[PDB]
Design an enzyme around this catalytic site. Structure first.
Site, PDB file in Angstrom:
ATOM      1  N   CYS A 170       0.446  -1.283  -0.136  1.00  0.00           N
ATOM      2  CA  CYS A 170       0.193  -0.068  -0.817  1.00  0.00           C
ATOM      3  C   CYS A 170       0.467   1.355  -0.170  1.00  0.00           C
ATOM      4  CB  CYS A 170      -1.207   0.381   1.441  1.00  0.00           C
ATOM      5  SG  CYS A 170      -0.359  -0.033   2.786  1.00  0.00           S
ATOM      6  N   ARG A 185      -3.644  -0.684   5.730  1.00  0.00           N
ATOM      7  CA  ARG A 185      -4.104  -1.660   4.526  1.00  0.00           C
ATOM      8  C   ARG A 185      -2.712  -3.101   4.046  1.00  0.00           C
ATOM      9  NH1 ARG A 185      -5.256   1.520  -0.252  1.00  0.00           N
ATOM     10  NH2 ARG A 185      -3.827   3.165   0.651  1.00  0.00           N
ATOM     11  N   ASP A 224      -8.713   3.075   0.584  1.00  0.00           N
ATOM     12  CA  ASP A 224      -7.325   3.306   2.290  1.00  0.00           C
ATOM     13  C   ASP A 224      -8.878   4.031   2.959  1.00  0.00           C
ATOM     14  OD1 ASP A 224      -5.755   5.054   4.638  1.00  0.00           O
ATOM     15  OD2 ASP A 224      -5.446   6.790   1.930  1.00  0.00           O
TER      16      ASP A 224
END
Length: 158
Positions: A8, A14, A124
């Site tokens: 990420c 994430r 996100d």
């Protein structure tokens, strides 16, 4: 022993979750000798930090230990890992931008392994509430289960 890298932007929300979920999926499939996981980020801003306290909370609550220390993608990663999974489009094109030609075929979008949740990305969650963090996990439980199947079918070979 095949090596999987989840990526990420900051490597605090994430991809640390992705890494935990995949480790869990692999262990359930009795495949711990064959696949190892790691995660890293396109940006080094958060290097050294633990995973976001919200994601660790929601993670644990969903059955996962999210225990990574943030680190940036490095040049050796493109060589040393076998497959590399981007959390969103920006991570995807950023990784391709930096990847040596011989290695570009290792790069995939995480969401291209989703079989039930319809999404263009792993969104996100940083600037939103806890529901956003569960959504991340939801998407990763979908993608990760299908991914182990596809790996074991040898479908990722270029």
């Amino acid at each position: 022993s095949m090596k999987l890298l989840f990526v990420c932007l900051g490597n605090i929300c994430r991809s640390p979750a992705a890494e935990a979920v995949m480790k869990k999926v692999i262990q359930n499939h009795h495949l711990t000798e064959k696949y190892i996981c790691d995660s890293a980020g396109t940006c080094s801003y958060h290097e050294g930090q633990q995973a976001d306290s919200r994601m660790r909370k929601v993670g644990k609550s969903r059955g996962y230990q999210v225990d990574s220390i943030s680190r940036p993608v490095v040049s050796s990663d493109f060589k040393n890992f076998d497959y590399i999974f981007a959390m969103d489009n920006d991570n995807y094109y950023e990784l391709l931008d930096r990847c040596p030609e011989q290695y570009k075929q290792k790069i995939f979008k995480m969401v291209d392994f989703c079989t039930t949740i319809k999404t263009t990305e792993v969104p996100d969650p940083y600037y939103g509430g806890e529901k956003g963090f569960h959504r991340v996990i939801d998407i990763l439980e979908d993608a990760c289960e299908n991914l182990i199947i596809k790996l074991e079918e040898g479908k990722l070979i270029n």
